[PDB]
Structures are given as structure tokens and as C-alpha cells.
Amino acid sequence: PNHPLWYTLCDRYGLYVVDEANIETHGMVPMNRLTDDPRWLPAMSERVTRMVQRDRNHPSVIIWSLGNESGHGANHDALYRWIKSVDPSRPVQYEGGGADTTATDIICPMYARVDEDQPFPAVPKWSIKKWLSLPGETRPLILCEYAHAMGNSLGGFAKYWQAFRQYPRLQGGFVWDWVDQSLIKYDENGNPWSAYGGDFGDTPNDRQFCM
Amino acid sequence: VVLQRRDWENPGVTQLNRLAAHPPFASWRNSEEARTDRPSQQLRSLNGEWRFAWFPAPEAVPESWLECDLPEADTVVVPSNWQMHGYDAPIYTNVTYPITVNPPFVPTENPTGCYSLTFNVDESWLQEGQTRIIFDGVNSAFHLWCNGRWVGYGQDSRLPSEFDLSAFLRAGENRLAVMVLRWSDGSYLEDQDMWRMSGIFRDVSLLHKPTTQISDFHVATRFNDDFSRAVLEAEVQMCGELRDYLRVTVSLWQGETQVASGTAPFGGEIIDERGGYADRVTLRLNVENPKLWSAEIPNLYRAVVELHTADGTLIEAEACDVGFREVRIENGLLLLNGKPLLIRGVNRHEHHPLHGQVMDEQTMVQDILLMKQNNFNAVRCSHYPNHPLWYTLCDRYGLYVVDEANIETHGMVPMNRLTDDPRWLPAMSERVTRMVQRDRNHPSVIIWSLGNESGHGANHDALYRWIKSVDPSRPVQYEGGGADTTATDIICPMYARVDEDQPFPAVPKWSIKKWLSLPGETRPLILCEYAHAMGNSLGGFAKYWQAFRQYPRLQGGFVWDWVDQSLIKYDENGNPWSAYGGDFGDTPNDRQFCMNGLVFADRTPHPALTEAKHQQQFFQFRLSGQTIEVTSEYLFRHSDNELLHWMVALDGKPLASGEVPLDVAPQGKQLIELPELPQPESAGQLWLTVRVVQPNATAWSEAGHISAWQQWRLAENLSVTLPAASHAIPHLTTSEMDFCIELGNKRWQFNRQSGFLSQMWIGDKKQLLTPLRDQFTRAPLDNDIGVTEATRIDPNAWVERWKAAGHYQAEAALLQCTADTLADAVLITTAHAWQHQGKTLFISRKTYRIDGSGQMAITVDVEVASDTPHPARIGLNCQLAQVAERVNWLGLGPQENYPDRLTAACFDRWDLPLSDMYTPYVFPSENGLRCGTRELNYGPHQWRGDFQFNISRYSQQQLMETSHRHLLHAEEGTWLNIDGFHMGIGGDDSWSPSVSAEFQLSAGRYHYQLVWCQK
Amino acid sequence: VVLQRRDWENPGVTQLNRLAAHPPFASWRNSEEARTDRPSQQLRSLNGEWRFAWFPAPEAVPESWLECDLPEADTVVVPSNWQMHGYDAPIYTNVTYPITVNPPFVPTENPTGCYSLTFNVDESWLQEGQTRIIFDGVNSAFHLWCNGRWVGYGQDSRLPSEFDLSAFLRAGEN
């Protein structure tokens, strides 16, 4: 959840907002180790429920998200249903565990390609065009993350937009991301420079991957 | 920190340092011991004598108690509830919380139980591995100390709390200290309609596991379309250091035969982008033609889970009973193994009249045996997880179980105030999740329930989905918020009636037949509670069973309930008696409302149990000419232990009999042709009675057990022969105050001022102590009373309508009393009016004809004002001088039966001791009626006609005035009530009028006739 | 008992004495001010300069800090991330946790930021009504004291934690 003023400005300027719970357990092995554990359900529930209690009156918020990169656990299903019960006015989405689980109203993959399948075991990233028409599948598809804009990038961006325009159920996506997470440091002359992972003695670190 | 934090007033803290929940463990170190389910050396019982001290509040517990014993403390058996030892009072309240409603706070005066134990621990237990303590039930919250050091904290009275004592223990002698709080924030979720007690009331044990251990295992069984093939899937979890040499073997046994086995190293399938569970393994075993589990045949396999090295060194084995069965809802029907169930259920609390809420194996087994013997196939764990052994016994004996989370918030306003509040979601979640984790491997559990009477809140929807996600093998149900909410797979109302709608705002109870077909509704309907069996009840039980059999999607229900929650108290002479709400100085209380059982607290059946048995029969019968058609309602079994015995009797006199083995496939039919029956010249009604007998003993019944019966009227020959003309003529004698009739050694006296027969003599011995008078009232049943009290009158209750109308106060006013001498008889004619404050309620017009044969024919014609509440009965009563040993009657019996509860009773000649003609309901009322009676014999007296009667040493007045059965005293002689007509007893519930229109005495005019003579 | 319970190593304790969550409030006492979304006298910003001291662990925090200002402490702008003032280093890691994966435990060496503020309140706030403090964002967990007395505890770095201070406040300086 963002600083409260953000939602006010999105209401007034006009942007559609996906409001997302402060839950990411990416580093767990497997990714759902905590989110499938009922002992972590209370901590997880407060991050979801208290977000809804705070932001439910903002028109700019159109979709609730259960968080990010925490696999798919039974806790997600419980909290999915909690939101569906308390606020039927907004769809609930969540990408974890393969982007099309029972805890999401929207097929919301990250970095699924336009034409190319990436058939990873358990959590494949199908071609977005192919994903829509898998046997039994009826949901809309909106990428929670796509077109990773790291450095000299956005090659093939036009391919997404052609597909979005052609396919009714391909309803777009969210570019990753808005702003480089570089920090200002100063050299011996007091001149400012842009710093990334590792430049603060921080180790281990993931270098320029924050930009 | 303990007194400072006050964790018992914080719904955010339900435990501290408590271990994860899991299925039953024993940590066998020998696979054969695991297979046979013999005792484990690694599982020690701490069910011995403990030290106990009672304190008014936790602030009153001295710090010295943590280190050493208190000398003031006593030595008490554990498990126990401390109220049962007399330390404080058990409280009976229904809905209203026993504490002020101020969540999460409890009273500052909070009865505190200080338990302690000094015990030996062998060195071997501490050298290697993990030693844990298991508290199966602590009501309602507790802190734990080991050797002076604080271990942890736990809430939820009805699930085990486990703590690691490895670092706390020493070799030789150790000491445990348990501070048990009566009230906590957990009490807000424990508002079940039952005695409020406290203490360590379930088993305490120590469990030794190796460091490298089985920490969890789940068993699933999936099937092909015709159940001829199964896959058993066992997920196994380990704790400790992961090693390449580690293996799990899951083996499946049928007796001493191994049927299947699987071995694998640890390392589950890839699950997401970060891999899989390295500490888990899933074993898959094929089983061809599995023997299927059901309540009909509880076929079980044994699964042994061995944790071992690749080379075959056993580390430990755990085990469980496996029942191969599939539970699913398809096309609106609940199916077991592909077949639609008919639930013959009962709700059962864990209650013992001496030990309170402590369960023992003997009582559990006693209950299961009686249940199955009375045609029950299902039990609801109202309203909490049970003692672990219960599920084992249900697995093995064969009963379907609804396992229900320990959550009831009935007393909140509105009912969902806590369950719709996300701040209470963590506490609720643990009561659901830890139940599922414990019980998921028991085949007897077929349905999960989210609790009871907590309204419908968002927390229910979340937890409904959690169960659906973690365990798709069982439907989830919940009644709160109107019984058909989004949190239930089954429409599961309580006390919804068969035909009658009850359209309450927001939460209507529709007629069950109507509910099924409401627009858009497709789910099965099974009542979580119906036929409230409080006192003289179960009127209209047959109506439910007719509907269940007719409607596919009406798949039965659970009777409320199994056993009276009465408690033993002792009088000044040390004699035991049954007590209910308020008898312990507990206030506020809900009096007798804790006693709703089919059996008394000591498991003696109420009369209603036989009505339940008959209606829940598994064989249905039809008669056509000489052909009996038997239909089986078994879904799985053939009738391989059943014979049909038939008997034809003329007014109780046996004419012919025989037996035919039953050979009926499940759901099949068998035609049985009766032989030619010789037509008796003698007058009367021929009756056919059939019964299904089990020739062989079973695990649940004795040889010769009767499982089903039915009766039909056959040919009737009406009597047309005139009685022999008498050579004597009765003589009439008249005074101002009496009409007297004399014939031989017999005399009748009619009082001319009262207009009643005041006395009768046989050889100058008086026969009456009280005159023969009309009676229109009964000592009110629990169903007549409802929730009415002196403090707050419910004007709608039958008793209150009768009282307000003056039915109990109404005095007979004589209108006419004449005597006429006839050719061979004396005729007495009378007329009476019963009036209250100017209003005539009833008129009784009678003739008494005494002939030369000594017989007195009584003809009664009664008028009842259309605008007075329909009367409880229309009959006569008197107090006879005679006290005789036996009661002999031709009519319905042998047990107590009422107009809306007489289907189980059979027409025949019955002969019982007088005491059996009285039903010792703990709260006294009208009781012991027998209907459809054509002849009654008592001492020298015989009454003939077509009447209902009861007979006992207690007047209706005394029954009405006495609140406990132990306070009743036998009156002089015998009170006889002979009714032409009697109102139904009802019982669809016991808090509103429930007697159906067809059983109300609303006809306005009534006629009956009796002949009184000397036997 | 704060150091003894270690609420920051217990996923069963995510708060203590925290008020219920709700939509943005300003408690206007004038309907027209509410309509126009103009400032409310009942909603006061504490975004001013605070006193701050960095510690390597909660065990290193002296008990005297509860009662009075540490002279070694600095005056800093709040809201702030203390890494941006140079007290310790910001860490950039993607997937791998910045701490050893051993739930629910965290490193014993646990950088602790001790924030303090001396302030006064309107006299009318002491006589009637309810005064709460709202922390819109605290990363990652915190204990709160008012006038030497323990108030509560909060987790979740990205939602407001609110606590009732009505029974803790006094006339003059707090």
C-alpha cells in the first residue's frame, strides 16, 4: 500500500490503481513455504484486511492484489475469499503460483511473451495469446509485469500492443517499471553520482538490477 | 511478565511456544508395533494423581508455587473438571455469556486452577531426541512451567496443546506447573449451550520423537468411476537434517496381509519458481478392488509410515486406520462411494453425570453401541472437536462424523459481531485449521463444520475457502446466518419444520421441502439439528422421515440430542439425584434446558429413543393381500445377517407365526408370500406384526437383535352377539345428597351436589379416594412451557394460553343430575359447565348406565368453546384406592406413546409392573400415556372402549408442582387418567408452539364411551 | 518485558494495543470545512525535527532514553529513512533475504532507531475526547512509549499504526 496521498491524486488526476498488500516472500524455498502455512495466516491477513479497510473508498482503486511473489498457498485462497466477501465491487488478482490460480480473477502473468511459450515446470509462462484459450479458460489477461525496462530496453514493446489491440481478452499490462532505484552518492569533490547495489558496501547485493 | 501481559485478555495471543498441530502420533520404534496399534514405549500417560490448588484470580497465586508444592493443595485425579471436585460451581447458561460481554476482557475475579506434578524422566529420553508434553484438553487457557521455568501458553479448550520440554527437563525427578484460567478471550468463542466448566479435562501425555522425525502425514484415497480401483496418496513431512540416504516407506495392510507398499527419498515435485519441498515426499500406492468403508461395513486397512535409511534402519514409524471412501456432492446430492446418503444422525455432547466433560472409553463405547442399536449411522460433534479416541471408535464401529470447530459466539449482538471482525480472524482460524490438521486422516469424518451459532461473518467465508483448498475430499458446512449462506455446501438448518414455514426476518426457517426448490437453489439439505428431544418429546418425528424418504435431496439430519446434560448431586442422606441449571447456585441459568437427550445421563433410554429407532429403520415394508414386500435402504450391504419373523394375533391372542430369511440386495426388494391363515370364528381384529431379527452377534449388537418392525390390520370380525341376559336388576336408592345403586356386592354412589361418581364399593370396600371427574388439562411438558418464566411471561406458549384462559383454575358447575330406573338398568344423566370469569370453557354431558351384569357404561359428550385455546386432553380421572403390582392392557405399547409419537408402538396384549407406567423425566410432566387402548386391567377393575390412558402414583397436580423427579412422593392409591382424546406433544423445537394442527384438539365437539366392570 | 518477549521474532504478535484500521479521518467540527477538504484543527502534523540515536541492537538501548533525551542523539527531519542520513547502509538484494532465512528469528545484531519528540497539546484535548497518534509508515517494527510509559507495538511497514494516547498525555510538555 502506498502513502495515503497517492490515492487522492489518482482519484483527482484519473489513474486506475491496483492496490497491493505488503506481502512478498520471494526468498523462501519453495516460494509458498510461509503462505501455505496456517501459522502465518494471521500476519498475512492483517496486511490484506487493513489495506482494504483503509483504501476501500478510493474510486481510483479498481483491483485488489494479494501481494507479490509468495507462491500460491492456502492462505491466499482464504484471503482471496475474504476480499470477495467484504468488497464485491473490485476484482481480486494475484500472480503467484502460475498466474492463473484459484486466488485470481484475472490471468496476471509477469513477463509472459506475446508469441513464445516458456513452458517452465509447474509455473509455465504461456504465450499470452495461447493462455487465453487454454481448455476451460475464460478469464481476462492483464500482465502484472511486462516489458522489463532495464537500461537499453523495451525491444519488442510494439508486439505487445498489436496483440492487446487484436485480442479483446488481452486487456494490457503494467510495464516494469516507472523509475530507476538509483541512490545519490558523492565523490571526493562533493559531486553527486547515481549509485546501485553494492555501492554502500552492501553484500550480498544484486548490483544494477534495482534500475 | 505473565501477570503483566495478560495474554488471556488478548485475541491476538492464542498461544506462546506451542508446537504445530498434526495427526495422532506415537513414535513407534518397531514397525510391527505400529502395524498392530499396540502401545508405544515412546508415548507415556500422565493420567495420574496431580496436585491441585484453587485461587479466585491469577494475582492470588503465590510465586512459591512455581518452585515447590503448596501444602494447602490437594491430590486429585487428572483428567478432571474442578467443578466436579467441588472447588467452585458449574454454571448452566444457554445463550447469555457466563461473563459480562466486554471483549476481549474477562472478570478480574477469574477462578484459577493451579495444577502440578512430580514425575520421573529416564536418562535415555534426554540423551537423544525430543521430549514433548501433550495437553489434549485444557479449559479454557493455561500457562505451563517446567522445573520453575516458563514453557508456554495455550487457548482453545478442545484441541491438544503441545510443548517441547527437551531443554527444560533433567534426569531423575521433574516438576510441571500448570496455571489454568477459567475465563479468557477464548471464552468469547466458547458459548455453547452446555455446562460451563474448567480444568485439565482431557489426557496429558509425554511423547518422545527422534530429532529426524515424521512431523506430518496426510492420507488421500481416490477412485475410478466404479470404485474397482483406488490410488492411496500419502504426503509425508519430516523435520531434522535432510539427507540423501533418508527414505519413507508407506505400507498398506489388510489384517496380516500387506496389500501395497511404496518407498521414496525426500524431495517433492517442483511447485513454483523456487523449487519444491525438499522436506516432503508423496507416496502413491495402487489398490485393486479396495474394500470400501461406510457406516454399513466399516472396512479398514492399516497404513504404516516408516521413516528409515536406504539400507533399512528404522528411525521411527507412525500409523493410522485407513477407510477407502469418497465423499462428494454431485447434482445436488451428497454421495458416499457414489451412492446418496440418508443421514440417521444425532448430535452428541461430551457429557458424564459424575465426571462432567471428561470422556472415558467405556462411555464412548456405550454411546456408540446404543446409537447403532437404535439405527443411527451418523454423529455431529456438537460443538467442538472431540476426545481423539472418539474418531478411532467411529472409524472402527462405523459412524459418519461431522467434525466441528470449537467456535460458538451465540451471545453476541448481533450473532456475527466477532465473526465478521478481522481482528478475531486469527483466533477463529486456529480453531478451524488445527482441527483439520488433527483429524483429516479419520475415514469417519465425512464433513467439516465451521462451528455453531456465530452468525455469518467474513471470517467464515475465509475459513470455508481455506478448508476447500487444503482438503477437497470433504464437504464443508455451517448453519450460521440462515443455513444456506456462501459458507456452506449443504443447506443445514436447525429445527426447520417439514411443511410449515417460519419466515423470521433475515434468517427464515423455510419448510424443508420448500427450501430445496427456492429459485436458484441446488444443494442437498441435511438438518444439523432437528426433533428437539427435551423431556416428553419427538412428536412429529415420523413426518420428517416420510419427507426424507420421499425427497432425494432431503438427506436426513441430526437429532438434538443424544444425552441429557444432567449432573449428579447428593441429598442429606447421601442419596444421588439428577440436577440441572440453577442447582449449584449458578445464576443466571437456563434451568432444565440442558436436558434434551434421547437417553438419560446414565444412558437409560427415554421413550422417544424407540420412536427414533423405528423411523430410522433400514428395511421398509408393504403389504398386499398375502404378500409382504421388503425393501432394503442399505446402500452397500446385502442382508446377510437378517431374518423376518411374522406373527398374526387376534386381539393379542397368537394364531400363527413363522420366519423367512431376508435375501435383499442393497436398495433391492424381496417378496414374501404368507401361508393361508385359518379364519377365526371368534370376533375381533387380526393384527400382523413383522420384525427383522439379526441371528448373529455383531461388533455392535447381540444375537437376536431386532432392527426393524411393522404392523398391519388384517381381517376384522365385528361382534354381533348379544351378551347373556342377566337375571338381576340394580336397585336405586335416593337421598338429598346421593343417588346410590346396588347390585350384589357392588355399590355405586353419585353425589347429587357435585354430579360425579364419588364412590364405588366391592363387598363394602371403597374403590375411590377421589371422585371420577372430567379433566381437560395436563401437567405441562417442556414443549408446552417453552421459554416462559414468572419473571418474563411468553404469552404464546401453550401453558400460558391454558393458564390465561383459566383451564387450570376452572371449576365444574353442575347443570343437571338425574336418575331413572329402567327395565334392567339404572341410568344416571349429568351435565356440567366449566367456567372462568363468566366464560364457559367446556360442557360435559354424560350418561352412566349400570345394568344387571354389573357393567357400568359411561357415555361422554364434550363441547369446547371455539375461542378458548385447544385443551391438552379430554378425559376423566380419579384416584383409585387400590395399589396393584401389574398393569395389563390391550393397546399400543409396551412403552409410552402419544398421538404424534406412537408409530414405534405396537398393538398387542401388554403386561408391565406399575413402575414402568411412569416415565422418570428429570423435570416432571404428563408422562406414561399409552394410546389406542381397547382394554385396561388394574387389580379387580377393567375398562373397555377406545381410549388413551396413563396410570401412576403421582397426580397431575403433583407433577405440575414438582420441579425435580427426586422430590416426587407416591400418593395414596393410584391416579388413573383415561382420555377420549389427548393433544400432541410436539417437539419440532421446545421454545415455540410445535404441535401440528392435526394433533390439536380443535373439533369443538367430542364423544367417547367407556365400560367399567369387575375383571 | 519488552526485551523479554521479543515481539519482533513472533509472527503471532503483529501489534499490541493498536487501534482498528479505517479510511482517512480528519475529525472536522465544521461541515463546510469537511466539504471543501480544508485543514482540520483536530488533525495535527508531527512532521517536524525529532531526536534520533542509532543502536546496533535493542539490547544496547539505555533505559534512561525512555525518561529523557540522550545528549549523544542528533536532531533529524522526520519522516526519514535513517540510511539516508548515513547511520547505516541501505542494502540492495533482489530475491535472497537480507537476513539468514530462519523464521521467525532475525539477527541479534539488529539496527535500532531510537526516535523521540518533545511536544505539547491543546488544553481542550486533555479535558474531553480521544487523542490518538498515527504513524503512517514505520519500517519494519516498533515499540511506542509516551511520557516514560509503554503504549504499544506495531508491524507492517506500509500501513498506518494508530494508538490511543488519551490516558498517557498531560498538561505542558510530553
Ligand SMILES: O=C1O[C@H](CO)[C@H](O)[C@H](O)[C@H]1O
Ligand atoms: O440451536 C440450538 O438448539 C439447542 C437447544 O437445546 C442447543 O442449544 C444447540 O447447541 C443449539 O445449536
Ligand SMILES: [Mg+2]
Ligand atoms: Mg489471548
Ligand SMILES: [Mg+2]
Ligand atoms: Mg447456542
Ligand SMILES: [Mg+2]
Ligand atoms: Mg512479531
Ligand code: NA
Ligand atoms: Na484487448
Ligand code: NA
Ligand atoms: Na529489479
Ligand code: NA
Ligand atoms: Na432423501
Ligand code: NA
Ligand atoms: Na439445550
Ligand code: NA
Ligand atoms: Na440373512
Ligand code: NA
Ligand atoms: Na413440573
